Amino acid sequence: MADTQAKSTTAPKAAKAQKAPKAVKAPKAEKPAASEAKVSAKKYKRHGRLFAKAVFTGYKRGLRNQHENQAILKIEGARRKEHGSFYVGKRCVYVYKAETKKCVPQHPERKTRVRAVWGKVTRIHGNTGAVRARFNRNLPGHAMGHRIRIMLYPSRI
Amino acid sequence: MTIRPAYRPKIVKKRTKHFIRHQSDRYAKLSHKWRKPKGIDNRVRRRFKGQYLMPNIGYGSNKRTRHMLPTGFKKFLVHNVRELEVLLMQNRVYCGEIAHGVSSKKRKEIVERAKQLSVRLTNPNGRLRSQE
Amino acid sequence: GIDINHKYDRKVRRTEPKSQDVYLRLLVKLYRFLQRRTNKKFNRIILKRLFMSKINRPPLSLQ
Amino acid sequence: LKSEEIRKVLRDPRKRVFRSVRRLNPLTNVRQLIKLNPYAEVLKRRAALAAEKRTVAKVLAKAKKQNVELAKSHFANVATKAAANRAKLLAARKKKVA
Amino acid sequence: KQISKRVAESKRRLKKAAVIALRKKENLVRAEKYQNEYIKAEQREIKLRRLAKKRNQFYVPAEAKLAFVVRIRGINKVAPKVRKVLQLFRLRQINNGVFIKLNKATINMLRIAEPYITWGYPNLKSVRELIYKRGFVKHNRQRVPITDNFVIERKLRQAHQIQCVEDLVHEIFTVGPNFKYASNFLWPFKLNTPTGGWRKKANHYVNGGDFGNREDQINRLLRKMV
Amino acid sequence: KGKKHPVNSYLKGGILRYSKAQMYKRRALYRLKDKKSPVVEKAKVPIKKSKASYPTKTFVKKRPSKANFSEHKRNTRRNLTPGTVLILLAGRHQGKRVVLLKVLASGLLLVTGPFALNSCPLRRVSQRYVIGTSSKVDLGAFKVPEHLNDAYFRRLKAKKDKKTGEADIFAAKKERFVPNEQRKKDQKEVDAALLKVIKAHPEGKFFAKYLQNMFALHSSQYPHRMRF
Amino acid sequence: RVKENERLLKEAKEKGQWVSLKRQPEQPKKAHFVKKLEEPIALAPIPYEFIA
RNA sequence: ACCUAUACAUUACCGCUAAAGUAGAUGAUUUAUAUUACUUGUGAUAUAAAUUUUGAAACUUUAGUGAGUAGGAAGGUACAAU
RNA sequence: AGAUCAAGGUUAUGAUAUAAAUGUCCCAGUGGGCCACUUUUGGUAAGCAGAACUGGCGCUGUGGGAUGAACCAAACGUAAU
RNA sequence: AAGUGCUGAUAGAUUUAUAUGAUUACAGUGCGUUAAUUUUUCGGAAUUAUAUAAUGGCAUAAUUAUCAUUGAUUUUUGUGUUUAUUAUAUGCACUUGUAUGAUUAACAAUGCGAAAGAUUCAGGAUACCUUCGGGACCCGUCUUGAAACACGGACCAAGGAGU
């Protein structure tokens, strides 16, 4: 009985398509004879354009340690662990303001008022979507409630 | 300016910040430098949770970047021009530091000769300051 | 970690004498050459007998 | 050490060091498998073609449903039995020697 | 003279090389016989069972030799005479393992550590993957892992008869009379830690579940733990 | 000759070549050309090909290690085909909705604006920068002008001044864009070619009057679980 | 244990193989098939005894 | 389904314990070439070139391994005068 | 019982050996201890005393019951995962 | 149980191998029999016999041995047989080329060690100050036990106890 479920959901590889490995539809269609393809709805909220917003929530805190070489994030789009795994491997970048310039504009133009350390998210951590993240240096400690970002780089389909 | 020495890598050290001697905060009869506090109660001797990271053989550097100053060499004491003839052919390896009992008479004789011997000093311009 | 770095992990016996000679070292700096090309047991017992103190490198009378 | 009385008895100039101390994985290096273990090539090159004919065995259902091609992507992949018939006509004409 | 040195090397340059080509045949002739030793046996239990169903008999499976023993609990808070038994199987650290040759005479050595060891009977795919993945070997009492077929052959060739990694399989997974020297030859492994976890680590298997006479569900562990 | 049998590219353990060369050899009569050139030979009559001692000497210098000098690896990319309009995230030209043209053997992928409509050139971008989109903009029967290439559009060159070397340099010199006049014509060859195919399609989100504004999206629409 | 080994090797001195002369306890045995043969199953002793 | 330890595993690194290798450099060693003995083809010669140093108390290499007061030995540095 | 010939299998239970084997300095210390489970006297008894067999605390940090020398995980070279 | 077949990632990459000793050997490439079958027709494509111990399939001979024994497990094999199978029957030079010496590296960008002068990129609690997150009793010592509601310590320079 489950043998067509080894078959029918290769129609996504037949509707994308690639080598077309299924003839039965699984279309999510409006037809009365088309009541399948089984979405794990619902959620309807973007948080994905560029610098898709996600505020920050302290380090990968033990109860009585820190391990501040890493950091942990709060990703406002996501709310189940199937959501957040689309944020694997993105960079993580956070700007924060300061006084002087001290650097010329040579690699593409900078009058230099903004200052920003950098980094890279890795893996999904919390069973609702909190996804820990490592930086270039270390997340400067007073940011627990600053509006850090995640840009789309790099991405796929 | 000077060619950097002889297979210059990333000098990357384990623990860098200095090591400051349990309870040297509230006694200024207590100096800066460390003494493993050998007495039976202590709060750091037991390698506890919070205190001034306790030294051992771990923290050292690699056994090729031993002694390696931030410009590739290993530092070396120099006195007069004859010991700069020791740095004749090794010039691409080590450097020199002009010993601070040398006056500005004799330090005129290092900085004009060993420049052409292509060695590096840490300190020229000691008393130069182009006066006597 | 485990527990055994127990005792003795420590091979006691002597590697080189507490003696700063330049003649006795010249035998050592020769007879280290002639026990690490051949494997002959007779050379090693020469080498391990180049190491005891004044006593126990025994006196030995002619009869 | 000149000597002509010592270096007729010396034995070993092991000039090469023979260190080569690196380990390797038995799945991520498929290259490793045959080296430490031949017959690992056998079990792959047995079951791989069995999967490979089975890749033909399910596109022919699509070539049963729609019957489109079979032009140059799998037409020559199924016309090889006509060449492989000749691999068994020798079983009918060249294997008749014993 | 080094002119006469040239014949000693270049012949040996062919002699050490050409025997590898023979060893390539030697490491192939065993394994091609080694494979279907499993396969006849894998069909042998279907044939004995189903015939006994046709002949209306209860066919028992064979009770097994070849256990495999992985430590669970520390170095400390250990019982009195379980300190010498556990140095007498070379389990010392947590998550290290060796094998045994089972009889009664190791059960009542295994029972007097049975709260602290979790011993099981492996399948095919564990033992192939064990010496492969986290297997090291022990020549001249050191620990230099695998990297070729050489690290068995160099020191098991004359007095014992083993020279390929699937032949060291043969004198353990099939159990034989050279076995006792065929796993002091291994250093204890270093198994990692099995993700998903350990389910409780409290008790013996058959009330709460962990250490002990588990003997068949050891394979769902070693797919993770190693 | 023949029967190369390289099935070393889908298994990936298949070799299948030793199974041929048993009877495939002729088993006797070895005849081959056997080039035995002694040409690297110091015939220093007036020649002096030792080589001549410009140095032959011990100028002491130590240089970085003999690296692998690796091969331009095959290019694993997600399955998408030109033409597909895509959202540029980069190049100081973010937000433009631009279309694939041609993949290149450097692991690169040709995109144009076009400069006629989008006011964007024939920019080559990374696949990791750019988010792929859903459906097809049909560009099957195109002229595929592959004569424009990667090495055709490298920086040319590091001369440090005026193709002469040791000369005088000035602040803010220009050597990397006029931009080139042929690329304007190379734009003109495809912009006239792309307008007829892009306006004949049934109109959509980024097709005719539709691509030219700057990605920005209302709620209840996904980066997450869209069949995107 | 001595004089058997002097005699069971002595009978082994006419065929050669094999000595088998050390000591081994009981082993994991075999894999039978077992007919009932004797009285098919159930045979169901299930306790109920507390109340007394 | 997740959660955290200086525990477990793997890559580097430190010191320590164990094991192992290296000294005819008025040589060794390739790279070419002239030749040759020619043994098909392997070797010796000659030319040209370049690599070849350390308190053998050195040097290379290999594995394992590291808590600690009471206490014992191990090399390391201050402040002295002869 | 001893010496000395004659015959003799593969040496005779498992599993190891992080190496085994010993003579000095009688080598510095230390000769007051504490606790839980079972086993247990004295007492009605106690965070008391009094013990045999282990493990631990003193010598020991540690992750966990907020806390706490012993409880339960684990016994502490510097580092990332 | 079999690479069944990927698709997506994480951080990490020893190596002055003479600064006192294969840079070699496995494999992959282009050159010198063959015959047609087949397909594309632009290549490719597909063909055996050439030799084996053959190793299974089957058949019978034969035996060691077996819970059992109609038997079946086998053992030693011995032979026949077709059917599968694999490795051996690749020298000669060449190649940025596979793998091998703790197997990480082609590309690209960013920049002139600019007479003196001096911008750029990372790092840098050197010992502060500034801004936040966890940690955290304040030091000797007798004792089973000291953060002690146990004793000694106001601060500092010089002197002091294994001769």
Residue E38 tokens, joined: 């499993």
**C52 shares contact with chain D (CB less than 8 Å):** no
In sequence order, what are the residues at sequence separation of 6 or more whose Cβ sits closer than 8 angstroms to the Cβ of residue F144? Answer: F102
Tell how strand F85-87 and strand F108-112 pair up.
Answer: unpaired
Residue B118 tokens, joined: 């292509």
> In angstroms, what is the resolution?
4.9
E105 vs C11: CA distance, rounded Å? 36
Shortest CA distance to B96 belongs to which of B108, B110, B109, B106? B110
Alpha helices in E59-149 (DSSP H): 82-86, 104-110, 124-134
Q: Would you say A60 and F228 are in contact if contact means Cβ atoms under 8 Å apart?
A: no
Interface of D with F (CB under 8 A): 30, 33-34, 40-41, 44-45, 48
Q: Is the CB of E139 under 7 A from strand I?
A: no
Residue E137 tokens, joined: 């070997």
Residue C33 tokens, joined: 């050459």
Residue E123 tokens, joined: 């399948």
Shortest CA distance to E49 belongs to which of E37, E58, E38? E58
CA distances from A121 to A58, A95, A143, D15 (A): 14, 16, 17, 50
Helix, strand, coil % over all residues of chain C, rounded to 5? 25, 0, 75
Q: How far is F194 from chain B (nearest CA, A)?
A: 52
**C33 shares contact with chain D (CB less than 8 Å):** yes
- First-last CA distance in chain D: 73
Whether omega before E133 lies within 30 degrees of 0, making that bond cis, reads no
Beta-ladder partners of A53: A149
Residue F216, amino acid: A
Question: Is G31 close to E62, i.e. CB distance below 8 A?
Answer: yes
If you search the block for the tokens 């892992």, which residue do you land on? E145
Residue E103, amino acid: N
In sequence order, what are the residues at sequence separation of 6 or more whose Cβ sits closer than 8 angstroms to the Cβ of residue C27? Answer: C50
Using the structure, give the distance in angstroms from the CA atom of C20 to the C1' atom of H57, rounded to a whole number: 10
E20 vs G27: CA distance, rounded Å? 40
∠ CA A126-A130-A131, rounded to 5°: 100
Closest chain C CA to residue E93: C2
Q: Would you say A94 and A153 are in contact if contact means Cβ atoms under 8 Å apart?
A: no
Q: Would you say F16 and D52 are in contact if contact means Cβ atoms under 8 Å apart?
A: no
Shortest CA distance to D75 belongs to which of D87, D51, D59? D59
Shortest CA distance to B83 belongs to which of B102, B67, B68? B102
Question: Is F221 close to A46, i.e. CB distance below 8 A?
Answer: yes
Tell how strand E68-71 and strand E117-119 pair up.
Answer: antiparallel
E171 vs E174: CA distance, rounded Å? 6
Q: Would you say B73 and B120 are in contact if contact means Cβ atoms under 8 Å apart?
A: yes
E221 vs E195: CA distance, rounded Å? 10
Q: Would you say B93 and B73 are in contact if contact means Cβ atoms under 8 Å apart?
A: yes
In sequence order, what are the residues at sequence separation of 6 or more whose Cβ sits closer than 8 angstroms to the Cβ of residue E116? Answer: E71, E72, E73, E78, E79, E82, E86, E211
E187 vs E13: CA distance, rounded Å? 33
Residues of F in contact with B7 (CB under 8 A): 62
Strands (E), B1-132: 77-78, 97-98
Tell how strand A149-150 and strand A133-135 pair up.
Answer: unpaired
What 3-state class would DSSP assign to B68?
Answer: strand
Q: Would you say F97 and F86 are in contact if contact means Cβ atoms under 8 Å apart?
A: yes
State phi, psi for E4 to the nearest 5 degrees: -75, -15
Mutate to test the interface with D, among C37, C39, C42, C43 (most CBs of D within 10 A): C37
F123 vs F195: CA distance, rounded Å? 18
Which H or E element spans position E71? strand E68-71
E189 vs E138: CA distance, rounded Å? 11
E180 vs E99: CA distance, rounded Å? 10
D25 vs E134: CA distance, rounded Å? 9
Q: Would you say A75 and A54 are in contact if contact means Cβ atoms under 8 Å apart?
A: yes
If you search the block for the tokens 């144009």, which residue do you land on? F112
If you search the block for the tokens 């994308």, which residue do you land on? A16
Which H or E element spans position D45? helix D40-65
E189 vs E126: CA distance, rounded Å? 13
A1 vs A6: CA distance, rounded Å? 10
Residue pairs spanning A and D at CB distance below 8 A: 6
C63 vs B30: CA distance, rounded Å? 71
Q: Would you say E216 and E205 are in contact if contact means Cβ atoms under 8 Å apart?
A: no
B76 vs B99: CA distance, rounded Å? 10
In sequence order, what are the residues at sequence separation of 6 or more whose Cβ sits closer than 8 angstroms to the Cβ of residue E217? Answer: E120
Q: How far is F159 from chain B (nearest CA, A)?
A: 23
Q: Would you say G13 and G21 are in contact if contact means Cβ atoms under 8 Å apart?
A: no
E69 vs E89: CA distance, rounded Å? 9
Q: Would you say B122 and B95 are in contact if contact means Cβ atoms under 8 Å apart?
A: yes
Q: Would you say A117 and A140 are in contact if contact means Cβ atoms under 8 Å apart?
A: yes
B73 vs B7: CA distance, rounded Å? 10
What 3-state class would DSSP assign to G35?
Answer: strand
Q: Is the CB of E136 under 7 A from strand I?
A: no
F122 vs F118: CA distance, rounded Å? 11
Give residues 175-194 of chain E lying near strand I (Cβ < 7 A). Answer: 179-180, 183-184
Question: Measuring from the CA of residue E36 to each C1', which nucleotide is nearest?
Answer: J56
Q: How far is D54 from chain A (nearest CA, A)?
A: 13
Which H or E element spans position F85? strand F85-87
Q: Would you say B14 and B61 are in contact if contact means Cβ atoms under 8 Å apart?
A: yes
Whether omega before F179 lies within 30 degrees of 0, making that bond cis, reads yes
Shortest CA distance to F227 belongs to which of B49, A38, E219, B79? A38
∠ CA F192-F194-F198, rounded to 5°: 125
Buried/exposed F161-200: b ≥16 CB within 10 Å, e otherwise? eeeeeeeeeeeeeeeeeeeeeebeebbeebbeebeeebee
Q: Would you say F92 and F112 are in contact if contact means Cβ atoms under 8 Å apart?
A: no
Using the structure, give the distance in angstroms from the CA atom of D39 to the C1' atom of J54, rounded to a whole number: 16
What 3-state class would DSSP assign to E179?
Answer: helix
B64 vs B66: CA distance, rounded Å? 5
Torsion of CA E30, E32, E33, E38, to 10 degrees: 120
Q: Would you say F82 and F107 are in contact if contact means Cβ atoms under 8 Å apart?
A: no
Which H or E element spans position F51? none
Q: Would you say E147 and D23 are in contact if contact means Cβ atoms under 8 Å apart?
A: yes
E10 vs E7: CA distance, rounded Å? 5
D90 vs A18: CA distance, rounded Å? 40
B91 vs B88: CA distance, rounded Å? 6
Give chain J positions with protein CB within 7 A.
1-11, 15-17, 19, 21-23, 25-34, 37-41, 44-50, 53, 55-56, 67, 69-70, 72-74, 81-93, 96-114, 119-121, 123-127, 131-143, 146-147, 155-157
CA distances from B70 to D79, E49, F64 (A): 71, 76, 19
What 3-state class would DSSP assign to F42?
Answer: coil
Whether omega before A118 lies within 30 degrees of 0, making that bond cis, reads no
Q: Would you say B100 and B120 are in contact if contact means Cβ atoms under 8 Å apart?
A: no
F117 vs F120: CA distance, rounded Å? 8
A47 vs F223: CA distance, rounded Å? 7
Residue E18, amino acid: A
Residues of D in contact with E226 (CB under 8 A): none
Question: Is E35 close to D39, i.e. CB distance below 8 A?
Answer: yes
Q: Are chains D and C touching, using the cut-off of 8 Å on CB pairs and a minimum of 3 such pairs?
A: yes
F179 vs F173: CA distance, rounded Å? 14
E190 vs E136: CA distance, rounded Å? 9
Secondary structure, 3-state, chain A: CHHHCCCHHHCHHHHCCCCCCCCCCCCCCCCCCCCCCCCCCCCCCCCCCCCEECCECCCCCCCCCCCCCCECECCCCCCCHHHHHHHCCCECEEEEECCCCCCCCCCCCCCCCEEEECEEECCCCCCCCCCCEEECCCCCCCCCCCCCEECCCCCCC
E131 vs E191: CA distance, rounded Å? 11
Q: Would you say A152 and A103 are in contact if contact means Cβ atoms under 8 Å apart?
A: no
In sequence order, what are the residues at sequence separation of 6 or more whose Cβ sits closer than 8 angstroms to the Cβ of residue B49? Answer: none
Torsion of CA E156, E157, E160, E163, to 10 degrees: 70
Residue F133 burial (CB count, 10 A): 19
Helix D40-65 / helix E3-54 crossing angle, nearest 10 deg: 60
Shortest CA distance to E116 belongs to which of E57, E74, E56, E60? E74
What strands lie across the sheet with E68-71, from one edge to the other? E97-99, E68-71, E117-119
What 3-state class would DSSP assign to F104?
Answer: strand
- Using a 10 angstrom Cβ sphere, with 0-12 exposed, 13-18 middle and 19 or more buried, the burial of residue F129 is middle
Strands (E), chain F: 85-87, 97-104, 108-112, 124-125
C50 vs C43: CA distance, rounded Å? 11
What 3-state class would DSSP assign to E117?
Answer: strand
Beta-ladder partners of B94: none
Maximum distance among all alpha carbons in chain B? 61
**F16 shares contact with chain D (CB less than 8 Å):** yes
Residue E86 tokens, joined: 């556990």
E115 vs E201: CA distance, rounded Å? 10
E68 vs D60: CA distance, rounded Å? 48
E69 vs E78: CA distance, rounded Å? 17
Q: Is the CB of B101 under 7 A from strand J?
A: no
CA D25 to chain centroid:
19
∠ CA B41-B45-B49, rounded to 5°: 100
Q: Technique behind this structure?
A: cryo-EM
Residue F162 tokens, joined: 């005026």
User: DSSP class of residue F153?
Assistant: G
